[PDB]
Design an enzyme around this catalytic site. Structure first.
Site, short mmCIF file in Angstrom:
data_model
loop_
_atom_site.label_atom_id
_atom_site.label_comp_id
_atom_site.label_asym_id
_atom_site.label_seq_id
_atom_site.Cartn_x
_atom_site.Cartn_y
_atom_site.Cartn_z
N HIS A 1 0.84 -1.27 0.03
CA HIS A 1 0.09 -0.14 -0.05
C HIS A 1 0.79 1.18 0.11
O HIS A 1 0.56 2.14 0.53
CB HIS A 1 -0.98 0.27 1.24
N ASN B 1 -9.93 -2.78 3.24
CA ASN B 1 -9.87 -2.57 1.98
C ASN B 1 -11.15 -2.19 1.30
O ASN B 1 -12.35 -2.53 1.79
CB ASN B 1 -9.38 -3.74 1.35
C1 HEM Z 1 -7.81 -8.56 5.34
C2 HEM Z 1 -6.76 -8.52 5.23
C3 HEM Z 1 -5.85 -7.05 4.95
C4 HEM Z 1 -6.31 -5.89 4.86
C5 HEM Z 1 -7.78 -5.47 4.84
C6 HEM Z 1 -5.12 -5.11 4.89
C7 HEM Z 1 -5.27 -3.84 4.57
C8 HEM Z 1 -4.10 -2.77 4.78
C9 HEM Z 1 -3.88 -1.43 4.35
C10 HEM Z 1 -5.29 -0.40 4.18
C11 HEM Z 1 -2.86 -1.11 4.58
C12 HEM Z 1 -2.34 0.49 4.20
C13 HEM Z 1 -2.85 1.48 5.33
C14 HEM Z 1 -2.18 2.85 5.19
O1 HEM Z 1 -2.80 3.29 4.29
O2 HEM Z 1 -1.03 3.26 5.70
C15 HEM Z 1 -1.99 -2.05 4.80
C16 HEM Z 1 -0.70 -2.09 5.06
C17 HEM Z 1 0.18 -2.96 5.43
N1 HEM Z 1 -0.37 -4.52 5.47
FE1 HEM Z 1 -2.20 -5.18 5.25
N2 HEM Z 1 -4.27 -5.63 4.79
C18 HEM Z 1 -4.46 -7.27 4.95
C19 HEM Z 1 -3.54 -8.26 4.82
C20 HEM Z 1 -2.11 -8.26 5.49
C21 HEM Z 1 -1.56 -9.32 6.21
C22 HEM Z 1 -1.91 -10.71 6.21
C23 HEM Z 1 -0.50 -8.90 6.43
C24 HEM Z 1 0.80 -9.42 7.14
C25 HEM Z 1 0.67 -10.74 8.04
C26 HEM Z 1 -0.25 -7.35 6.25
C27 HEM Z 1 0.56 -6.51 6.57
C28 HEM Z 1 0.73 -5.13 6.27
C29 HEM Z 1 1.85 -4.38 6.39
C30 HEM Z 1 3.10 -4.73 6.98
C31 HEM Z 1 1.52 -3.02 5.93
C32 HEM Z 1 2.43 -1.64 5.96
C33 HEM Z 1 1.77 -1.00 7.13
C34 HEM Z 1 2.69 0.19 7.58
O3 HEM Z 1 3.86 0.31 6.87
O4 HEM Z 1 2.62 1.23 8.34
N3 HEM Z 1 -1.50 -6.93 5.71
N4 HEM Z 1 -2.62 -3.36 4.94
O LIG Z 2 -1.64 -5.36 3.43
#
Ligand code: HEM
Ligand SMILES: [O]
Ligand code: HEM
Ligand code: HEM
Ligand SMILES: [O]
Ligand SMILES: [O]
Lengths: 682, 679, 323
Positions: free
Chosen positions: C65, C138
């Protein structure tokens, strides 16, 4: 050579010209200047690349155990232990595994004294052919707390006060004893730290403990609960506190020099790896919960079974790149070993992985030469700061048709993969509690104290007396008294005397008279006197030096390290009186003729502080060391009031002095010279 | 193999079992849970070591030139150049040195389009046997600013607005043109970026420049002033802006794919290294100061002297470990080369060393495999984050009796050490000023504009008209016009039209009619057409595909990459109409029978967007490409109003079309199709 | 003002003299040189302090993202929801709570196009009086995979090929469709990504989903299974792919400019927060497992209950420091 794998990264600079870090020969002893006495040029790329690397040398010290030292070595298994564990490094008789071991204190920062009073770390890495296996232990078998979430509270309370950062490397202040008395689980480890385990003579004279109950698991998945032990082949030995304090100032590197000298001189120290094994259905069958890290298992209930032996025989080449950079983890586990529901061990698994991101500033720290395994790394991890490899597989994901399934999954039945103990279950409500089986905080501290010798017990009481007397807050001291009184009414009353507090009344809920073996230090003489230090005090006048040389040569035949001491560095003298102190030696012998520097003009010289030879002899006697004098030098014994036929005192000709001193080094500390409570009453 | 030294750090996972980062075989597709539908356990060390490494994969992108790509290769010296340089990599005929080259844009971030309009980076590392030597250059011989202390100002004004981070990878906004007009030195590089240099066809079709004057130094210390030049063997070539805009969305990887495919197909690109050499006493002899990086030296005064050739023939194995991690420095200098008092170059030496600390979070970035020299490192540096070596010398200081004087000092006379040019002097007051010799910001922009073809000039004008029309502030638009009028009154007048501003009256102070060679793109045909791309528009109906396959086989004989396009991926089809776009090809030819997809039912299919075959032909024609049709397919050309009479349009039978298209590809762009102001 | 608390760290440079980062007025348009045409001196602290900060401006982009934009706003509860949750920010009618929302793509890097076909993020922070509560969701109600340990595999597969880092912000390459076909759980989110959800008209024309089942708990421990829904008051709208491709080149900032313009023009977008509430004993009663994030609960089985409304009415002042 246990360091053999490290030789491919070793850099030899002899015979070569100076270069920058990107190649090209240079000179780097003058800055580029605009004119004869002009300003330095920004275009001096040589200056900037040299000073930038200096500017960035330091990395954060370890959050705990920041002070310590380490060495390489070999572990050899004594048998095929496949009947209890699938662990490869224990799978055959005489199978050898490279190790690295780091010893440490806990509270003090990087530059603090080795001989502070503290728990001591004892971390061993096995570089097995199925991954690195770490036993991150201490020289004390129990820990302060029962849940890992309380670790910051414990460490904050014993580390310096956050307003002034006072005191350094010490539990003797208000916040620490406020925590010991407010969290009574901590009193068991505290008693150990207040004993000889808190001020050991050397790393080589400590036992080691994994503390936690772990699990050994066989190929078919059957498990047994296990406690790890390291039993020193050098014997356990400890100092006295009044000596450890002077040693902290005289030689803060006492312990790391000890280990380095022993290895350099070819007297590599050894420990045997031993286990206690417990059936799964008996985890709570010995008067406590084996998931409780504040309890050890008495050897009367489960004896130690030796599996192999570890020998530390290679010093590091670069301390920083090896000792400072190595990253231990209790999560470094392999097939054949598993964790338990120990709430302290559970949080460690997260904490040691996470803190490496702070110490190494990135996720690729396992690529450092000292952290690399010897068994190979094949996965789909990529990128990260300081990525040192170039991966070939471009289909870095699973599952995948395009990479043909490789790297492939390994588990219990395929590829000798790791597997959690199959029979382990969870049962009950999700809770933020601790099991009621963890509640007894006093029985085992009483057990430990009961099992020490009378003078050993006095050392524990005198350490508490010293420590608690530094607490300014009156209520904290009385809180300490109440807690101590639940361990033993007599201990509380003898501590109370130093505190000026009233002897508390008996509270016998946890009192008992049971004792256990393996817990004492001073009730057993050393199995060997190799490497032990003898200071021979001589003089450059008369014929004393020639005798000290012969005295030294015969002592060296028995494996002792002898330092001949005199006014200046005459031929045969190893050290001056100005540079000498009794803390550096395990026995002090006055050479014949050297009695001249103990009185009269010979004792008043510009070349050493006034009274130094008398002080060295007085310190050694009062700290319980074997002390001696050859021939006429018995007058030196006289001048400090020491009698010739006292225990651990040897006067006579050279040969009987040599034999008497070597016999006394096995005893090591003569506890007749330390008063016990009640001795002075009329 | 240029990558030979990188072999020992390569890791092969073929046939291997999965492990942790500390060894030990594992499975890692299931979290450890407390019960069948239970929560994940903290003690799942496998999960946390896998995810922690994923969580920490990214490093900061380059503060500038974030978007780019690179390749390994070999430089071969054409002679023994010891009479002009002590540099070892130029010291013998046929001497070979491994290279790595990174090309880039400047303003856009890591994931921005290759075909944005921008200055382009052209950075070369020579892994010489006397240390790493970098020429960190651009595809444009001049830079916006005269003093390195102004670089943050330049870069902030060009990069996205700090309140909303709009716009990406573009000079077409208020703050950039506010800086260009407030800092008139920037007008020269601006004109170059508004030319074909701002939208090159590929990295392989760019010249390269060190920009700064440096010094070449012989063994005895005598120095020459020097300008580094890279002359592409592929010829210079550029897009048109309306084409580059579409390509940015249709394939933002257009340039990095082009470089990858050229090497992968054995068509390694090549550049000759050339120098202009100037005696020290001629530093101020040619109408400007050679310390001034906003000027270039006309080749009429100093011809390009070729010293060797560089060929890029090895793609990287892992992009991040190699391309992303490599750390270029103008301070990476070797014996036989030295700096000059160019106030822009002087500050670069500080800022490239410093910025690696941010990008690599530690001082040991030169120990990374892609940054290591081949010549050996021996000094008393120790420790630092990620220290990867174990030094033997425990006496890590100089001077010292205990290390016996090793590592030893090296200077001009012993040890082949680096040495600053012996004759360089400092003289005068310490000042925070620029030399008055730097004060002409308009003559050379005028010289550059004079030396382009009429339609080439019109491309520059239409770039400026497009860009400045995005500036909302009226006064900035007038400030830009006031500065443009200093270069040419006709340029200002023609730009003023698009902005609805009045034609300013002439300011003739710097007007002149001089021209110089070597700066035009469109006045020269291409030396070769190998690797150029031809899209053959066909159809699965009838016998068109059979003829397209024959057309393709003959075009491939000339080293062209041919894509057959049809409604679906039938046998012999390389791409569907849904995925095809004219931006991907250098020539479009309609196979016979395919006119059926240009009108009627054959143009209305659920398998591609409506009118897509006609759009590709229309796009290709309107963007100046060679376009053609075989046989009855000329109806497709008639359907869009294009006649075979025109230059760059070919019809007739197959062999007629092949020879014409291959002729047209040498011309590359047909400028007859672009209207000129008052033509 | 939703940004009211951030005023005290706002810095105004209008009317002021240039300074260093440690104070003291300066000029910083000329390097200090040794002579009229001389080299720059190391003692020019003004130059080094200015370039060191520029040299160190960048921080790592989000691992996923990385491409997105955000804004401030207010969430207002429609009622006292204490019968289903003890959450303070839902504890009273008309209660207002500051929010910040970031919308995003998933695959592309920092400078990728807004109109790439992709799943889109919809991350909402509630700055409640009992701590920060985030709904990190999302615009698609189901995710590709069923266990978080597979996330590096999914992301590696969709992101560019690691040999040449091609292609940017796109699933249309071999490795992605290898994973989609080798890990069949992915096909639900895949189909959503292939629909209008993959190329929305703007952030304001998307719905939002928490995806996971969560729990709402009352003061006495009573729990219900909950799915979070954001319902756009502007209506869902999407592009067509041949249009989004051209838009990726004509204006990579299409969505972030669209959100910026709507707020600045006074046309603040709004979403209603709505929930599906399921009894604990019905977690497996609707033809699938409610712990499975690759399934959504059809609204025929549980209609939405509207909890409140959020409106985004304040653009950030500095993108980096805030967004
Ligand atoms: C239902 C499943 C998921 C949704 C709805 C989702 C949603 C999101 C969103 C919206 C962001 C960006 C937030 C922003 O704008 O800063 C993000 C970032 C991220 N997501 Fe997910 N994600 C999902 C699955 C996962 C999974 C399974 C993992 C790891 C096990 C993950 C790890 C991360 C990481 C590490 C970031 C970076 C956040 C940051 O750098 O501050 N995501 N995700
Ligand atoms: O994510
Ligand atoms: C039986 C209990 C424990 C034992 C035997 C133990 C032992 C050790 C040892 C020997 C070291 C030093 C390793 C070396 O020499 O590099 C160490 C460091 C450390 N310990 Fe513990 N410890 C215990 C409890 C804990 C707990 C409960 C936590 C946190 C929840 C913790 C966190 C750490 C950390 C963060 C380090 C620093 C590691 C590094 O920076 O590489 N320890 N411990
Ligand atoms: C003639 C003038 C200049 C030229 C030809 C030039 C060229 C380049 C090129 C090609 C790169 C990309 C290197 C790569 O591909 O990794 C780069 C990066 C960079 N440039 Fe410049 N540049 C110029 C001026 C400046 C100035 C005046 C400064 C600062 C005072 C500067 C600071 C930087 C920095 C910090 C980087 C990032 C380096 C890294 O992170 O590895 N540049 N430049
Ligand atoms: O620890
Ligand atoms: O740059």
């Amino acid at each position: 050579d246990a360091r053999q794998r490290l030789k491919e990264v070793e850099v030899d600079d002899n015979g070569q010209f100076m270069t920058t870090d990107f190649g090209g020969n240079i000179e780097e002893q003058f800055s580029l200047k605009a004119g004869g006495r002009g300003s330095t040029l920004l275009e001096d790329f040589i200056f900037r690349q040299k000073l930038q690397h200096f500017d960035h040398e330091r990395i954060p010290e370890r959050v705990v155990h920041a002070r310590g030292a380490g060495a390489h070595g070999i572990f050899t298994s004594y048998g095929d232990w496949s009947n209890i564990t699938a662990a490869s490094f224990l799978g055959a008789k005489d199978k050898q595994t490279p190790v690295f071991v780091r010893f440490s204190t806990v509270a003090g920062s990087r530059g603090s004294a080795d001989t502070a009073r503290d728990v001591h770390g004892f971390a061993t890495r096995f570089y097995t052919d199925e991954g690195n296996f770490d036993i991150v232990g201490n020289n004390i078998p129990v820990f302060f707390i029962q849940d890992a979430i309380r670790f910051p509270d414990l460490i904050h309370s014993v580390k310096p006060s956050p307003d002034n950062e006072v005191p350094q490397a010490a539990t003797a202040h208000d916040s620490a004893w406020d925590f010991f008395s407010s969290q009574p689980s901590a009193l068991h480890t505290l008693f150990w730290a207040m004993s000889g385990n808190g001020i050991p003579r050397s790393y080589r004279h400590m036992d080691g403990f994994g503390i936690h109950t772990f699990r050994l698991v066989t190929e078919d998945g059957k498990s047994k609960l296990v406690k790890w032990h390291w039993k020193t082949k050098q014997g356990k030995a400890a100092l006295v506190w009044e000596e450890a304090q002077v040693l902290a100032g005289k030689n803060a590197d006492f312990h790391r020099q000890d280990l380095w000298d022993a290895i350099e001189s070819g007297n590599a120290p050894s420990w045997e790896l031993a286990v206690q094994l417990i059936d799964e259905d008996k985890a709570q069958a010995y008067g406590f919960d084996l998931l409780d890290p504040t309890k050890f298992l008495p050897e009367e209930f489960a004896p130690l079974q030796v599996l192999g032996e570890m020998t530390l025989n290679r010093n590091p080449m670069n301390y920083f790149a090896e000792t400072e950079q190595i990253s231990f983890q209790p999560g470094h586990i392999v097939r054949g070993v598993d964790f338990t529901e120990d709430p302290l061990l559970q949080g460690r698994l997260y904490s040691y992985l996470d803190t490496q991101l702070n110490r190494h500033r990135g996720p690729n720290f396992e690529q450092l030469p000292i952290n690399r395994p010897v068994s190979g790394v094949h996965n789909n991890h990529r990128d990260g700061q300081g990525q040192a490899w170039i991966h070939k597989n471009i289909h870095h994901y699973s599952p995948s048709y395009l990479n043909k399934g490789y790297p492939a999954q390994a588990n219990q039945t395929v590829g000798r993969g790791f597997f959690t103990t199959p029979g382990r279950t969870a049962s009950g409500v999700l809770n933020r509690e601790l099991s009621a089986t963890f509640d007894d905080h006093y029985t085992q501290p009483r057990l430990f104290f009961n099992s020490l010798t009378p003078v050993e017990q006095q050392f524990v009481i005198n350490a508490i007396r010293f420590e608690a007397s530094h607490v300014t807050n009156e209520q904290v001291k009385k809180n300490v008294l109440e807690q101590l009184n639940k361990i033993s009414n007599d201990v509380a009353k003898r501590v109370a005397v130093a505190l000026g507090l009233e002897a508390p009344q008996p509270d016998p809920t946890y009192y008992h008279n049971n004792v256990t073996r393996g817990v004492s230090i001073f009730n057993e003489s050393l199995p060997t006197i190799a490497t032990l230090r003898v200071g021979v005090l001589s003089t450059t006048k008369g014929g004393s030096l020639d005798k000290a040389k012969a005295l030294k040569e015969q002592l060296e035949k028995d494996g002792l390290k002898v330092t001949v001491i005199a006014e200046y560095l005459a031929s045969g003298v190893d050290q001056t009186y100005s540079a000498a102190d009794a803390t550096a030696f395990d026995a002090v012998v006055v050479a014949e003729g050297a009695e001249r520097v103990f009185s009269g003009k010979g004792a008043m010289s510009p070349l050493f502080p006034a009274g130094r030879p008398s002080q060295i002899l007085t310190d050694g006697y009062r700290w319980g060391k074997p002390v001696a004098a050859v021939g006429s030098a018995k007058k030196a014994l006289q001048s400090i009031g020491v009698e010739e036929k006292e225990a651990g005192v040897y006067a006579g000709a050279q040969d009987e002095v040599i034999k008497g001193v070597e016999e006394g080094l096995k005893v090591f500390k003569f506890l007749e010279r330390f008063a016990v409570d009640g001795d002075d009453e009329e």
